[PDB]
Structure 1
Amino acid sequence: SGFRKMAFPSGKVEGCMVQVTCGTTTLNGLWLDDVVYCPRHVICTSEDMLNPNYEDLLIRKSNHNFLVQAGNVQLRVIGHSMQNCVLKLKVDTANPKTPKYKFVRIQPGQTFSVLACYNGSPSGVYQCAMRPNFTIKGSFLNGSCGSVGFNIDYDCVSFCYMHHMELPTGVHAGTDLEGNFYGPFVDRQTAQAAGTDTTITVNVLAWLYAAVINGDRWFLNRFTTTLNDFNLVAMKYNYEPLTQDHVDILGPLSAQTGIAVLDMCASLKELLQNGMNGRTILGSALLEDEFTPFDVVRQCSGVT
């Protein structure tokens, strides 16, 4: 027992990290097969980032201007193309450490591990959620661009995120591996509104189930609620409205604990209306929304 903000083992992703330099800019690239994927802003200088004309900037670049280094060895670039906000650098050598992989677009409210890198070198790994507003609250300094988000199902790594930018508000924005930004963001040094964020209700409920499985039960009560009544409370507290799909995804946890989803909702309703009264749940003093129902089951059953 015990419940932690657990990240996937980062080994398979570490073997893919490379450094990409273009002119004065260095960031991280992901080397899968004979292609290196990196943020397209690697081609920019300080003056460009205010409103870059990426097409024009890229035209002044040739294959030999993209210096790709996998630790101590240099990769030979034989092609370059821009797809949305990513550059795809064709190299003459397929990565020997390429794991089985997929590029996937995650949905808001889903979680993933981030392998934070600098100069193509891994610094650390953490688990996070894609906020309902498409931002991520990560830990990314200058040069972390190109660090990726992923999930692992047995031997297959599904890459879902590539880091690109830190908004003036300190939150993070990036793209899928086809270079499409999550959210309304643009790779420009400009103030950009991130939408109103909400708390991921299904995840808080999954975490209340994890708490019950792992011994923390003080918040369970004699009450129940309806999806309509709960959603009135969720509206007041800036929580995502709960749907039957979310209830259905919580099914396995409801079955394991024997606590009906709407009974758990009434505990959440009371916690929202009264707070924790200076108590904790799984070592937290707030309602945690970065564990999905799948994360809770995987961690509580020890899926490797």
Structure 2
Amino acid sequence: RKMAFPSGKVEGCMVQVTCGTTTLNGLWLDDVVYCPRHVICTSEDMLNPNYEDLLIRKSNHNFLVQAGNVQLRVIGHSMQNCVLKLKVDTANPKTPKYKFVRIQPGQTFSVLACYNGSPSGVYQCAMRPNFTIKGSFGSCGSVGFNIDYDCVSFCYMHHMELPTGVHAGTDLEGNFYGPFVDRQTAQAAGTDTTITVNVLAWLYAAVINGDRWFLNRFTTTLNDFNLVAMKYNYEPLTQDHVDILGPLSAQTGIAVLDMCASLKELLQNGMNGRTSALLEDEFTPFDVV
């Protein structure tokens, strides 16, 4: 199963941020609330927002922050790239151990989808190679995260829905993933590709769970693999990726390029009614271990 991280440590940080008639989610960590800066935009503003001009006209009391029943007093504000940082006068008592990290395409994380500050559901995600999320998003400001030994690594905040139905957002320093902007433009996700290194790690997981019907007696050069895989809209496999899969290659006795040969055959043949009936690409080599 694609499992999400237990969401309780993040649930205790979710708040509601209202500015004018716009309400969305914020993340309350210590004495700062993080939220998308477009909370200060009024829809019409979203066509050509001048965020510096819109923000200089706001005072602390224009921002209504609600943590459940309690209103939090905003005592300062500042914009870092595309995220607004609202200084409040109370440090969140439920702040977990945390850090901010920027992830790369192929990496996975959990999203706690929220509406008006209240957690609605949690799901496990991958950052697609086109820098979008195929999610289920009024959920602006919901965040993505991993948890490692009680420490929550926040990696994603939701800002925009793209016309294809997918989602774009930033890291927690406000820098967008991919070429997207917090402006209603004709921006669209480029053609998405399959995360090849993730499919191979999963195939190694299948062998580890005792399934090997899909192996064959062939091998492949790296370049021949990539020439074939690219015809199926698979991401190129790099020497870094080959190195990453090294441990799983050792645990199963199957060489990386040998597993690549199996993948080539799977793309050519399909599953012939066997199994998931899909090649799964949202488990990382770290996840598989």
The two structures have a TM-score, normalised by structure 1, of 0.92
Tell me how far 1:66 sits from its aligned partner.
0.6
Identity of aligned residues (%): 100
> Matches of 1:5 and 1:128 in 2, distance apart?
9
For the 8 Å contact 1:81–1:87, the answer to whether it is kept is yes
* SS state at 1:190 partner: coil
> Matches of 1:6 and 1:95 in 2, distance apart?
28
* SS state at 2:157 partner: strand
Tell me how far 1:51 sits from its aligned partner.
1.7
Tell me how far 1:55 sits from its aligned partner.
1.5
* SS state at 1:105 partner: coil
> Matches of 2:165 and 2:120 in 1, distance apart?
20
Aligned-residue CA RMSD (Å): 1.1
Tell me how far 1:252 sits from its aligned partner.
1.7
Any gaps of 5 or more consecutive residues in structure 2?
none
Tell me how far 1:80 sits from its aligned partner.
0.5
* SS state at 1:247 partner: helix
Cα deviations across residues 169-209 of structure 1 (Å, max 9, x unaligned)?
Answer: 11110000011110111111222032332211100001111
Tell me how far 1:279 sits from its aligned partner.
2.0
* SS state at 1:222 partner: coil
> Matches of 1:286 and 1:77 in 2, distance apart?
49
For the 8 Å contact 1:146–1:162, the answer to whether it is kept is yes
Aligned residue in 2 for 1:155? 150
Tell me how far 1:13 sits from its aligned partner.
0.7
**Among 277, 285, 291, which residue is 2:272 paired with?**
277
Tell me how far 1:32 sits from its aligned partner.
0.6
Tell me how far 1:161 sits from its aligned partner.
0.3
> Matches of 2:80 and 2:238 in 1, distance apart?
36
Cα deviations across residues 236-284 of structure 1 (Å, max 9, x unaligned)?
Answer: 111111122111111221122121111111110101112222322xxx2
For the 8 Å contact 1:167–1:191, the answer to whether it is kept is no
> Matches of 1:274 and 1:240 in 2, distance apart?
19
Cα deviations across residues 189-234 of structure 1 (Å, max 9, x unaligned)?
Answer: 2220323322111000011111222233221122221212111111
Count of residue correspondences: 289
Cα deviations across residues 87-117 of structure 1 (Å, max 9, x unaligned)?
Answer: 0000011111111111111011111110101
* SS state at 2:109 partner: strand
For the 8 Å contact 2:164–2:189, the answer to whether it is kept is no
Any gaps of 5 or more consecutive residues in structure 1?
298-304
> Matches of 2:127 and 2:112 in 1, distance apart?
15
The two structures have a TM-score, normalised by structure 2, of 0.97
> Matches of 1:216 and 1:65 in 2, distance apart?
59
> Matches of 1:11 and 1:66 in 2, distance apart?
26
* SS state at 1:82 partner: strand
Aligned pairs for 1:231-246 within 5 A: 231-246=226-241
> Matches of 1:255 and 1:117 in 2, distance apart?
42
> Matches of 1:215 and 1:128 in 2, distance apart?
26
For the 8 Å contact 2:31–2:90, the answer to whether it is kept is yes
Tell me how far 1:152 sits from its aligned partner.
1.1
For the 8 Å contact 2:164–2:188, the answer to whether it is kept is no
For the 8 Å contact 1:234–1:240, the answer to whether it is kept is yes
